[PDB]
Amino acid sequence: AEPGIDKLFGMVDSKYRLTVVVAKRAQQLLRHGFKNTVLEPEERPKMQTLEGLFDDPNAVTWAMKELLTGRLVFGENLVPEDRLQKEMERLYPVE
Amino acid sequence: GSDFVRFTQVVDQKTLKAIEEARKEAVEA
Amino acid sequence: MLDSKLKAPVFTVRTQGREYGEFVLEPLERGFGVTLGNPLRRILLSSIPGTAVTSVYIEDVLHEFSTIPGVKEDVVEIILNLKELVVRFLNPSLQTVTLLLKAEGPKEVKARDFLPVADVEIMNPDLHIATLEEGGRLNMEVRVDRGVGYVPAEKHGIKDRINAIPVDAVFSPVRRVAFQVEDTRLGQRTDLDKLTLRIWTDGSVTPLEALNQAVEILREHLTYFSNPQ
Amino acid sequence: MLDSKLKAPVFTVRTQGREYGEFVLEPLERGFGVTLGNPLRRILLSSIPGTAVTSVYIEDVLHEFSTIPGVKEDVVEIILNLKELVVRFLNPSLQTVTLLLKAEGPKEVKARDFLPVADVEIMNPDLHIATLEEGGRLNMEVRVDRGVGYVPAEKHGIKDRINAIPVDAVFSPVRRVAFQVEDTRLGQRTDLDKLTLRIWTDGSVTPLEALNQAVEILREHLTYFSNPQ
Amino acid sequence: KEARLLVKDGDYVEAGQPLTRGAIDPHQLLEAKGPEAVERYLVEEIQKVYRAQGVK
Amino acid sequence: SGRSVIVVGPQLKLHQCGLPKRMALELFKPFLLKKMEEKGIAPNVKAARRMLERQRDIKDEVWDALEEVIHGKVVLLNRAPTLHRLGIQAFQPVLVEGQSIQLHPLVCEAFNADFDGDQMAVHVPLSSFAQAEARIQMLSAHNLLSPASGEPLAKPSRDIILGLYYITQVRKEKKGAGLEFATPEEALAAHERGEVALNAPIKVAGRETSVGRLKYVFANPDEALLAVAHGIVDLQDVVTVRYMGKRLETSPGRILFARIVAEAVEDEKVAWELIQLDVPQEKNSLKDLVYQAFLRLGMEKTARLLDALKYYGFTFSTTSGITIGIDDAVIPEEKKQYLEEADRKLLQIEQAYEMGFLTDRERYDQILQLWTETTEKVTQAVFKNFEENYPFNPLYVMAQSGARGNPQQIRQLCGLRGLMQKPSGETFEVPVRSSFREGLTVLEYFISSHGARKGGADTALRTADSGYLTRKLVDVTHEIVVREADCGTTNYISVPLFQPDEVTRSLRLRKRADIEAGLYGRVLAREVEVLGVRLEEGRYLSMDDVHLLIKAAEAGEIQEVPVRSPLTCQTRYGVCQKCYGYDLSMARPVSIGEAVGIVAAQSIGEPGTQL
Amino acid sequence: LSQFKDETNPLSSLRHKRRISALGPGGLTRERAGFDVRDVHRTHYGRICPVETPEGANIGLITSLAAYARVDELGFIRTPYRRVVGGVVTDEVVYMTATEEDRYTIAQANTPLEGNRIAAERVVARRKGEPVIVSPEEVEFMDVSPKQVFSVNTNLIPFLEHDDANRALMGSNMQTQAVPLIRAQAPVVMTGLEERVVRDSLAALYAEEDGEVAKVDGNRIVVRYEDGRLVEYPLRRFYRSNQGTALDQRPRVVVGQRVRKGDLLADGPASENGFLALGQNVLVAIMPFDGYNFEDAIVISEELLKRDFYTSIHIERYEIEARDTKLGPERITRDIPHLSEAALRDLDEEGVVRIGAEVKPGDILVGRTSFVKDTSLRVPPGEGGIVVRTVRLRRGDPGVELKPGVREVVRVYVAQKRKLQVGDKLANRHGNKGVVAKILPVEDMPHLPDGTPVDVILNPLGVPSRMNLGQILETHLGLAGYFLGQRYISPIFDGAKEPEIKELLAQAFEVYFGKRKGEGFGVDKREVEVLRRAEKLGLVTPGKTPEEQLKELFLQGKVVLYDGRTGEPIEGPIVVGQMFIMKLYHMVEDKMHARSTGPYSLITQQPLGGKAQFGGQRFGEMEVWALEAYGAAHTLQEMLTLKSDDIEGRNAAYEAII
Ligand SMILES: [Mg+2]
Ligand SMILES: [Zn+2]
C-alpha cells in the first residue's frame, strides 16, 4: 500500500501523529501553491499518461515521501503559529 | 481529538531558519 | 522434405456443403494439436466478420413496441425474425444493402419473399418472417451491413429512417468451431498429434473460407513483433 | 497510423540478464493476449531446442543407488547437480558431445575440470558437481545432445556405456514462462488487453532471443496451410 | 424440594458459596464478596456464553 | 451519497473498489468541471455545467480528465445494516462500465453481504484532511485484524481455500506387492518393474519412498513443474526434489504453494521457514500463516501475499474442475449397518415398552439415547470412510477443508438428520430416517418444517434483540477512551490458569483458547520467572508468551497471573495502556487517545446477533 | 386491509389471491405475539402449506392454504382424503374437518396399492398427527395425494423430495416474483399443474367449445364454434402491470383452425403452449470458476444476449398538471423563457410532447411556467424509453374531477425494452438464488467435446451449505432431456427415480456418442488421459473401455469438458443439464440512487431531491458509530456540516471545489 509505512511509523511516535503530520503537509502544499515541497526536483511523484504527478495529482503521496525524507521536521508544538504562517506567506509567492 | 497529537506543525529546516530570523528581528536600534 | 517436413500435417478437407466442414491435419508433434486448435477456434468464433440486420424500418409503425393489424407476430418478434435471417454478400463492395419486402392479405411472409437483389443471396430463403392474416400491409426495409462480430443497436445508431430502428449486430458466420486432437500413430512416434477440426457455419461462407481468413488474421497478429521495443 | 494502427500493441521489453525478462505487449483486442500467450507459452516450453545431458557414466559406478568412496554424495545427488548444468554448442553439428572428467584427492569437482570441447562452451563453469574426499577415484563422461525442451531418461535410454546411465533431457534453455493479460483502458474503451510475459532462461540465450525463435517458428507453423488438400 | 445443592454436610464452605445449583442474585454476591469477586464472577458468565457460542 | 446493487470484483483488489463511472460522474461534477476547465473542455465552469448536464453532450476526454482528477482519490462504502466498525470501509474508486457495483470478493463476509439482492451505499470524504484521515485509518487494506478481538477479519474464502487445499494435497491409491524397498535397491528395481507392470501404483506404500520418488528426481523445482507441464506428473504426487539443500519428498502442489509464498514476499528464506509445507492446506493453517506473515513483514508484503493467494487459489479451484454430483454424496455402507443396528435396538425398546415394563418416559429416554449414540456412531464411520476410503471426496474434500460444511451437513445429506424435536421442543420418537439422497417422506418433511420455522422465527427475533443490546452497549460504554500514562495504581488481577470445577471438584489447567482470549497481550503485574524465562513486570504478553505460560501451567508452576486490568486501572475515566494492555488491530499495544469503549460495545453486541 | 394486486405473473397473482394471514384489524391478532402461532400446528396437515409463509418479521403470519383444501362453509378448511374401508380403499374423497380429522387414521398416499386394496400390511398412517405404523385395516382415510398437502405454489418444484424446507420456502416465494419474459419456456422437468395453472390463471385464452377459427388478428380473434355461432374476443397486445410489464395473450391458433371446447386460444404473457413458461431453460455446468461464482454469483455465457432469450418491456407512467396559482395559473406551455429553444423541438405540441420517441435524462416532459417563471415537466433521471401514450384532461373534465387548484392534468406513458444486463439476478425453482456476476465472451468459455457449450456456470459451494438435492436431480434430468429432446412430468415425491435416471442416462449417452462415432471419432487423447485420472481417483473402473467408462461417467451425470481459453479438457467430470432458471424481481433497489448536488428540505436544510435529483442517501446513526470507532474527526465533521445541514458551508465547499 504505502512505501516505508513501517519506517515512517518508526519515525512517528503515534499513528495519529503521523496522520496529522501528513495532512498538515498536504494542506501546506495546497494552500501556498503546490511548491511547498523539498524532494520534488530529482525524484518526484510521476503520473502514467504523462509526468503530471510531478505537480499534484495526489499531495498525500508527496507528504509521505517528504516524511520518508528527513527534509521536513514536524513538531506537535515546535514554532509560534503566527510567525510560522507569516514567514510561510512572505517566503512563498507560490500562493 | 487527542490534544497530544491533534496539532503537530510540520516544518522544514528553511522554515526553522525563517523563524530564526523572525526571532532575530526583535533587536531594536 | 521427406523425413520431417514430409512428416507434416496433411491438410485434408471434407466439407458438407459450404456450411459444415472438417479439416484433418497430422501427424502433429507434441502438444501442437490443441496448441493450435484452441486459438484457431477462438479466432473463428471471434474475429470472423459477417453480416447482420443493421437497422429496420417499418413503413407502418413508428415504435418497435407496436402491433400491425392482421399481423399475428409483433414488431419486436418480426425484427427478431429479421435478425435470424442469414444473407450472403457477393462483393466487398457489398457492405450496406437495404432489403425491402411488401406482403398483403392471408399470406405467410418468408425470407425468400424479399425483393431479390443482384449481388446478394438469401442464405435464409425459407426463413419464416411473418404471417399476414387479411390485407396485412407489411411493407418495410432493413438496412443490412457487413461487419465484424457484435455491436449493440445503440452504439452505431443507424437511421436511414427515424422511424427505422437499429438492432444489436451479429457478424460471426460461424455456428460452432471445435477440434479433436486425437493421438495419431507415426512409424517412429505413435505419440503424434492429429487434429480434426470440425466447424458448422451459417453457410454465408464456406468453413475453409473463414478458416484461412482467421489464419491470415492470426499471422498478422504474430507480425506485431517484427518491431522490437 | 494514429487510430487503430497506432492502436498497435507496444512490443515492450526489459531483460533481466539473459535468463530472465519482462515483455509487455499492449494493447490488445478482445481475446488476444491469451490467444497469443497460451499457444506461444506452450511452444516456448517444448519448441525451444537446447543442450541436455543425454547420459552419463562413472567408470566405477554401476548402480545409481551406489556411492563412490572419497565422494560422499550418491549417484542421485551427482546426477541432479549435473541436471542443471547448461551448456552451449558452437554449431548444430554439436548434436552429441561426450565430455569426460578425471579427478582424485580431497578436492571439489565443478564444471571447469572437464576437458574443454572446442565447439562446446559452459556458461556454468561455477557449477560444483561433487567433492573428492580423499584420493576420490572419479572417472566420468557425460553425453549431451542438442534437442528441444524436455526428454525423460528412460525413453532415450542413451547408453554410450552399457553401465552408463540414461539422463532425463531438458533442452529448452528457458527455465519457464509466465504470461497474463491485464485489462487496459483506452480513452474510449476500457476493455483492452495487455499481455505481459516474464520468462526464465538457463542462460543459453537471452529471453528476448528465445521469444524471437518461438514467434518465428510459430509463424512458420502457420505456413502449413498454404497448400490446399 | 427441587433445590439442587452441590455442597456436602460438614464440609467447610467459603462465604457466598452457592449452596444450591442454579443462579444467584448479584446483590448478594457483591455483599458476600464485595466488588472484585463479583467482577470475576460476572466476567466468567459473560465469557461462558461466548465460548458456548464459539465467540473468541 | 448514493446506493445501489453490488457485484464481485474478483479482478479488484481490496485496496481499490469496483465503481461504475456514471455515479462518480454526478458525484464529482464539481471536480469534473474543475478539471475540464483545467482543460479546454468547456469555456467556463458553467458552460461546463451545460456541457455535462446532457448524456449526449458527453465527451470522451471528460473521461481522462476525470481519471486524472481521481488518480489519487478514494471513497467510502457501506452495507445497509451497519453493526461494527468495518460496516464501512475506504476504497480507491475505479470507474467501470455497467450498472452494478464491483466488489472485492474477500470482504463479502466482512460485510455480511451475500449476493441475494441487497444493495450497498457509498459516500466520500471531501476535505484534504478529511480524505487523508479516511485513507489512513479507514482503509480496508489498512484495517486487517479484528479489533473487536484480535482475530484477522480478512479470512480467506471458500473457493481460494479449496483451491489451495486441493493443490497442496497428496494422493495414495494402492500397494499390494513388495512394499519394503527401504533397505533393498533390488527391491526398488523389482517394484519399479511392477510399476512398469500394474504391480506398483505410483502412490504405493514405498518404505523409503513410493515408486514416485524413486522413479523421478528433480534438482530444480521448475523441473517437476515442467514434468507436470508435459502431463508427466500430477500436482498431488509423491515426488522428491533436491531443495536448496534438501531432498524434499513432497507433492508438486505443496512446493508450488511454497513458491507462491516465495514470490508474494521477497524473503523466500522466511517464506519456507514459516510455512508448514508438510500438511494439506486448511483454512486454519491459512489464518495462522496470514497472521505470522503480517507479523513478520507487515501490511504491504502481507497484502501482496493475500492478493497472490486469492489469485492462485481461484486459478487452482478453476483448474480442479471439481464439481458436486449426487453420487458425490457417498453413503458409507457402515452407515446402513449402524442404521440397522439402531432400528433393531429401537424395535427392542418398543417391544419392551409394549408389555409395559418401560414407562413412556423410560422408553422415550431409551430411544433418545439409542439414536444419540448411533448418530455419532455413523458420524465416526463416515469420517473414517473419508480418511481412508475417499480422501478426495468433493463433498468430503470440502467438508474436511475449511471452505465450507460441517459434519452435520454431510450427515443430513449423506446420512440423515434423524433426531428432531417436536413443536414443544421434544424430539419425535421415530427420527428422520431418510436423507436427501433419499426422498423425504411427506409426513416426515411436514414434521421437519416445524424446526425450520422455529429457527427462522428465533433468528429474526434475535436480530432486533441484538440491535437493542448493542444500542444499550454503546449507550453505556461510549465514554471510555484511552487517555493516560502508566496508571500508577499497583492493583491488578491474578487471572486463574485452572478451571477448578469441571467435575464437582476438578481443578484443572483452564482451557487453552479461553486463556489466550483472557490473557493475550496483557501486562505483567510483576515479573515472573516461570519456565526459566524472567517474565518481567509489566512486560506485554505476546502469543508466544501465552504458549510458554500454557506449558508452564501444564507444569503447574503457577495457577493465575500477576497482570493489570481496567478494573484495577486508576485512571478516573479512561484506562492505562498498562491498565488496558495490548490488543489492537495492529500488534503493538493500544495508542493513547483510542475510543476503547466503543470498540468493546461493538465487539460484544455484534456477537449477540447469533446467540 | 386491501391494497395493490400482485401483478407480477398470473401464478404470483393467484398465490396472492389464495393466501390468508393472521393479522388484521388487530383484535384478531396483532404483530407482537405469534411465536406460538408461527409454529405450524399439526392441524395444518392438508390444511396449510407451512413452506409458503412469507419469511421475515411476518414469518408464520401469512400462508397459502393446502392446494386441495377448501373452506366448507365458514373459514373452516376441509381437505380431500381417500376413504379406505378395511383393506379396501375407496376412491371417494371426504373433505374432512380438522377436528373430525383426529377421529380417524389417515393413510399416506405413498403406500403402494393393488387398486382399492393396499399393497402393504404395515403402512404408516396419520392417526392424530402422528406417524402410526399400523395395518391397512386401521386407516379410515388415506392421503388423496401429496398435492393436497401443500398450496399451489408449493407443488411447482419437481424434486422437493431431496431439498430442505429452509430454502424450499425461499424458492416457492421467489416463484411469485418471476417477470414474464419475451420468450416463455416451460421447465425441462415439470410438476404437472402448469396446464391447470394457466387454466385457473386467465393468462391465455381458451376456446369455449368445439369450433373453428374465423379470424386471428393481432388484437382480436373471431372464433366460429361447432354450435354454428361465432364470437370474437379482443386480444391484449401490450398492457401494463401494477409494476409496468407486458400483458399479451400469445396468438396460438391459425385462422380456420379447429379448436375444441376449453381449447387454449392465445397463451398468456408467461405461457409457452398453454403451459407455464417464464424464465428460460439453459444448459448449465456447476464448477467453481475463478471468482464470478463466488458465493451465489452466476456466470453467464454471452449467447443468451445474442439470442433474444432474457428480456422484458418495462412500462413507465409519468404524470403532471397545471394549476391556477393565486400568483398566476401555471400554464402548461412550451416556453423556456431564459436561454434555449433547441430542446423544445421535442415538446412538439404546446405543453404536451410528441409521441413515440426516445428520452434522455433531464428531457422536458410537460411544459409549464409559474410566476412568468419557467416551471415544466422533464424526463426523470435514470432511464426513459420511447413515448407510447398520453392523456390530456385539461379543465375539459368529461367525467374526471381534477383536484382544486389543478388547472389541468396530464398522463404520459413510456416503454423501455429492458434486456438482461450485468447486474440482473436469477434463481432456480429448487431454491438456490443469486445474481449475475459476469457474462463472458462465449469464444473462450468452456465447451463440450461437442462444440455445444453450456449457458451458465455456478459456484458449487452453495449447494452443500444448502440442503437441496432436487436441484442436482433436475440438473441430471434436464441434461438428459437435452439429447432426448423431450420433457418429463415428475410428481413431487411419486415422480422419477434414479433408476430411470440412469436408464435415460444410458439412452442419451448412447445417442450422443453413437453419433460421435458416426462422425468418425471415438475418444480423444484428452478423454483417455482424463479417464485414466478418474481411475486414479477410482471414479472410473480401471480396465474398462474409454467408451464404456465414459458411458458410466455419463450415467454419473458427469462428463469431460474443454476449456476454450486454454481449450484444455477439465479434470474431473461435471454434472450439467438444462435447468429452468428464472429472473427474479429486479426491484427499484437495482437502480442507482446517486445524487451529489440538488434540493434540500424546507424546514431543514438536509438535502432532499427525488423527482428532480436522485436524492441524498440515508446516513443512519450506527454508521456514525463506526466512524466513531475510527478516528474520523474532520471527515465526520464535514459529513454532518458540509454534507448534512450547512447550506452556507456546503455551498462554500462547492465554490472552493469550483
Ligand atoms: Mg443478502
Ligand atoms: Zn490506567
Residue numbers in the entry:
A (entry chain K): 2 to 96
B (entry chain J): 1477 to 1505
C (entry chain G), D (entry chain H): 1 to 229
E (entry chain J): 1307 to 1362
F (entry chain J): 626 to 1236
G (entry chain I): 391 to 761, 785 to 1071
Passage from the reporting paper:
The type 1 and type 2 RNAP-Rho complexes both revealed the closed-ring Rho hexamer with RNA threaded in the central channel, but they have different Rho binding sites and orientations relative to RNAP. Our cryo-EM analysis also provided another Rho-RNAP complex (the type 2 complex), in which Rho binds near the DNA exit site of apo RNAP through its NTD side. In the type 2 complex, Rho is bound to RNAP in an inverted orientation, as compared with that in the type 1 complex. The Rho hexamer assumes a closed-ring conformation with RNA threaded through the Rho central channel and binds near the DNA exit site of RNAP through its NTD side. Four of the six Rho protomers are involved in the RNAP interaction: Rho protomers B and C contact the base part of the β-flap domain (residues β727 to β738), protomers C and D contact the jaw-lobe 1 domain, and protomer E contacts the clamp coiled-coil of RNAP. The T4L insertions into the NTD did not affect the RNA release activity of Rho. Moreover, the deletion of the RNAP β-flap tip, which is critical for the Rho-dependent RNA release, enhanced the formation of the type 2 complex. Therefore, the inverted Rho-binding mode in this complex is unlikely to be relevant to termination. The abundance of the type 2 complex in the cryo-EM particles suggests that Rho may preferentially bind apo RNAP in this alternative mode. Therefore, this complex could potentially resemble a posttermination state formed after the EC has released DNA and RNA.
Transcription termination is an essential step in transcription by RNA polymerase (RNAP) and crucial for gene regulation. For many bacterial genes, transcription termination is mediated by the adenosine triphosphate–dependent RNA translocase/helicase Rho, which causes RNA/DNA dissociation from the RNAP elongation complex (EC). Rho is an adenosine triphosphate (ATP)–dependent RNA translocase/helicase with 5′ → 3′ directionality. Rho forms a ring-shaped homo-hexameric complex, mediated by the CTD.
